[PDB]
Write a protein that binds this DNA or RNA. Structure first.
Lengths: 172, 116, 68, 94
RNA sequence: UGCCUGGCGGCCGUAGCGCGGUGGUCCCACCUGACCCCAUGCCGAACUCAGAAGUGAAACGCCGUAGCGCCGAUGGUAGUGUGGGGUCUCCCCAUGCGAGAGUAGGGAACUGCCAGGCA
RNA sequence: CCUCCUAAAGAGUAACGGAGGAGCACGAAGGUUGGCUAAUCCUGGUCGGACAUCAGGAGGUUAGUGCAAUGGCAUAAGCCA
RNA sequence: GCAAACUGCGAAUACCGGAGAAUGUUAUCACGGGAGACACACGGCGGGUGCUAACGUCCGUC
């Protein structure tokens, strides 16, 4: 909720005047943020998966959950663990990342507008996690990055563009 | 959809209870109110019904939905049903979780003398 | 290189605890005042009349027993 | 508009149908509208005679029953796979 | 005695899907924050706490839309029991039972009890 | 020892007629109560190529239901606690 | 386009169960005694096997 009040104060007015919605919640709003490094290299050994889980726990305020597969992978093989938030941690983590993580990107050519699901969600993988200062260089084992997929109530790609612009959408 | 899953869950309870043909006491939880009814085995008729919407319960309640409101509703329905002569009737939480308002209402009813 | 089908029929009078139909799968489901076995073998819970009907969201075939 | 006259069916079943077919005749029905549909007995020879013209199936036909002419449209015709015989003609009142 | 909503049954496609508008009077739905009752195989997602802070966005509510799905006559046809016949492989005769598909049409489900709001 | 047809629509109705599997196990892989509900294909995303990864979409069991086969399981007999 | 091991549809004969008419030496069932009986065949009805070539062979029924 660190940025929730600021969001409601600033994004809502501009989005309402540029769209002229009726209800307060008609503005697209993020519901969950997914952090899941698709390392896909723990097949040989699970130590890498343990290291990834530890990194997720350190970076995030919670502990990751280990999932299983739906490449030479069997059924029910645990390969990666994902992290998601729902609550104040949403805005806390988003504000932190947009303050320190997103601005500090090396060779930052910009986001990918086309990288949508076609229905109001954006998915992309940003490598060289060194952008996040929370990543301690002591415990880094390989060049990795977060496969962030923003989950938003946007009903179309136009709403996704508008809500990304609300966060100033640095550039393409 | 939460409604679909809730109805799916309640259907099993209802269909397993229907084998006995006994008057059911169905309680429904609403975000703003609480409903409680006693229905005969046929299901097309109800013996008694009371909800927080009625002034009889909301007069002393600042709001219709909370632990205190659930307890008051339970006491009222228990008194009315005891006046009716339930004689060890069966309860049903509309396929819900016995956690809050349902739990408080059931505890209040059992305090009044409910035999279930 | 043992016996399926309908053994007891609607409108018949049977004594308590009488097997009416055994089914390989759930082709039929026991109705009111009717029990079910491990092998989905329906047996009469009382004495009276037997009815075969079709009901349910999928229109499944059901077997019921009513007071004579 | 064709001056077509037929006879009302008196029996229900395959018996009269086969009797008509053997004697170079066949049955038919007239339905459509709130008025109750009725079965009719069409003579095969006359049907062949007045169906050769292409206008038979074009406009609304006239059927005469007990000296009563009514407008009916031929819904469909069912024929034998190889025998040029009309198994059954279905009409609609118009 | 009427219009509207909620709960519970018969009803299980003439009850479903597609389009428009209509609703915050009551009621209903979303929801704020949650250290407090409670909690996650991580998360107030659900569960539970103070309510209308905000709204009718989805949802449901009515009607029209027969677009779609569905049912569906009426006859006839196929098939066939019984007895017989022929050129007895197969077909037909007398009688009875009577397909599927298709067709006109129906098709915006209906019905029962309680509770609440407006007349 | 067991399942599918062969086989003329109650049960049965010859084959050396064609398919076959099983000689297993669980102190859980049973039960109690609670919670949840797949396959199939597609969109975005370094390796990852389209399918090692998550989010969303058509849909709600054609996944799964420890053993070969066949019927059944949405109330889930399917998964977890 | 196909499917004895395809059914999204779906017949009459055959079954017992309930009500009902006349029928027929009770034509129906149990018990007890006493039998033969344990190699049938022709044709028709719908099939399998067999090379539907078979006046070959086997099935349920008259």
């Amino acid at each position: 909720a660190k940025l929730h009040d600021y969001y409601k104060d600033e994004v809502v007015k501009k989005l309402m005047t540029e769209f002229n919605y009726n209800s307060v919640m008609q503005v697209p709003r993020v519901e969950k943020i997914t952090l899941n490094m698709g390392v896909g290299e723990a097949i040989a050994d699970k130590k890498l998966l343990d290291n990834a889980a530890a990194d997720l726990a350190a970076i995030s305020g919670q502990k990751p959950l280990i999932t299983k597969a739906r490449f030479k992978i069997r059924q029910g093989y645990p390969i990666g663990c994902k992290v998601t938030l729902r609550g104040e941690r949403m805005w806390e983590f988003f504000e932190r990342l947009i303050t320190i993580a997103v601005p500090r990107i090396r060779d930052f050519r910009g986001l990918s507008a086309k990288s949508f699901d076609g229905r109001g969600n954006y998915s992309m993988g940003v490598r060289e996690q060194i952008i996040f200062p929370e990543i301690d260089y002591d415990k880094v084992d390989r060049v990795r990055g977060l496969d962030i997929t923003i989950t938003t109530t946007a009903k179309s790609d136009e709403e996704g563009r508008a809500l990304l612009a609300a966060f100033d959408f640095p550039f393409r | 959809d939460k409604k679909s899953a809730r109805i799916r869950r309640a259907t099993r309870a209802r269909r397993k209870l229907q084998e006995l043909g006994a008057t059911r006491l169905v309680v429904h939880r609403t975000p703003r109110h609480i409903y409680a009814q006693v229905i005969a085995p046929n299901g097309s008729e109800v013996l008694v019904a009371a909800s927080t919407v009625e002034k009889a319960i909301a007069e002393q309640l600042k709001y219709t939905g909370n632990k205190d409101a659930a307890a008051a509703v339970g006491k009222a329905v228990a008194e009315r049903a005891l006046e009716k002569g339930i004689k060890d009737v069966s309860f049903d939480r509309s396929g819900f979780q016995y956690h809050g308002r349902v739990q408080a209402l059931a505890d209040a009813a059992r305090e009044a003398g409910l035999q279930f | 290189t043992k016996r399926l089908g309908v053994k007891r029929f609607g409108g018949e009078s049977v004594l308590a605890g009488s097997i009416i139909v055994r089914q390989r799968g759930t082709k039929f489901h026991a109705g009111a005042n009717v029990g079910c076995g491990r092998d989905h073998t329906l047996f009469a819970k009382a004495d009276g009349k037997v009815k075969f009907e079709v009901k349910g969201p999928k229109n499944r075939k059901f077997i019921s027993i009513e007071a004579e | 508009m064709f001056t077509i006259n037929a006879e009302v069916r008196k029996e229900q079943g395959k018996g009269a149908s086969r009797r008509l077919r053997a004697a170079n005749k066949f049955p038919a029905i007239i339905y459509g509208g709130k008025e109750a549909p009725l079965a009719i007995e069409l003579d095969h020879d006359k049907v062949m005679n007045m169906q050769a013209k292409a206008e038979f199936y074009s406009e609304v036909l006239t059927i005469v029953v007990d000296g009563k002419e009514i407008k009916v449209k031929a819904q469909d015709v069912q024929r034998h796979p190889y025998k040029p015989k009309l198994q059954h003609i279905d009409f609609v009142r118009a």
